[PDB]
């Protein structure tokens, strides 16, 4: 997953109105850059999670989550809760219904619930 | 607050009263608006009732502060996306205009967090014996 993120990074690696637009473009490029960076750091933490974990079931739980969700979004999610992303992934994977439940209903709230999810969780 | 429950309810009720291919556009708009309004009412009463349940003396007061602070819809949406939690958080809203401003400044995904984090932070885990 990191390498896929790395490819996005690799992409980065490789008159008044115009001033407003060129400026807007600079801002946009920078934004993309930062998000992607968020994505590698997210990857860094995701793999911080993955390396500290050595769990392919957690990886499998994610796989269930992955079929369910677009990865970049999950990565943004990883960005949101770097500390518990792995944990978060595990719950959802364990809870196949819950993640879709998040999708079907109030995704905005669902992410909000994600912290809670990222919460009541009593770890191991 | 009970009086102010009406203020929010009234604007909505008035629209609820209805003195507002093309017809398909119409149906979509109307129904959606109506659903949103019903939600707002669940919320309006809730915003007000829960606030009453708190009864902290400045609810409505602060409401103004927050309302002025932010586009009303944001908060309203927040109410939608928050139970009593909401109004209490509205309370907090007034509780922190600059902080709130920071909360506002933060991007939309971040915004969730703002609300998010605040909510539990802002609630009542009970106690034992």
Residue numbers in the entry:
A (entry chain A): 72 to 85, 139 to 248
B (entry chain B): 69 to 88, 144 to 252
Original authors' sentences:
We referred to the bases near the portal axis as inner base and those far from the axis as outer base. The two base domains likely interacted through electrostatic interactions. Residues Arg240, Glu243, and Arg244 of the inner base domain were located close to residues Arg240 and Glu243 of the outer base domain. Local reconstruction of the side nodule and stalk-like structure revealed that the side nodule comprised two copies of the base domain, whereas the stalk comprised the column domain, which connected one of the two base domains in the side nodule. The SP dimer primarily forms through interactions between two copies of the same α-helix (residues 231–245) within the base domains; this explains why a recombinant SP fragment (residues 238–303) weakly self-associates into dimers.
Tailed double-stranded DNA (dsDNA) bacteriophages and their eukaryotic counterparts, such as herpesviruses, possess a dodecameric portal at a unique vertex of the capsid; this portal serves as a channel for DNA packaging during viral assembly and delivery. The portal interacts with multiple copies of a scaffolding protein (SP) to form a nucleation complex, which initiates the assembly of the major capsid protein (i.e., coat protein) and other minor proteins into a procapsid. The P22 procapsid consists of an icosahedral coat comprising 415 coat protein (gene product [gp] 5) subunits, a dodecameric ring comprising portal protein (gp1) subunits located at a unique capsid vertex, and an internal core comprising approximately 250–300 SP (gp8) subunits and 3 ejection proteins. In this study, we present the structure of the SP gp8 in complex with the dodecameric portal in the P22 procapsid at subnanometer resolution.
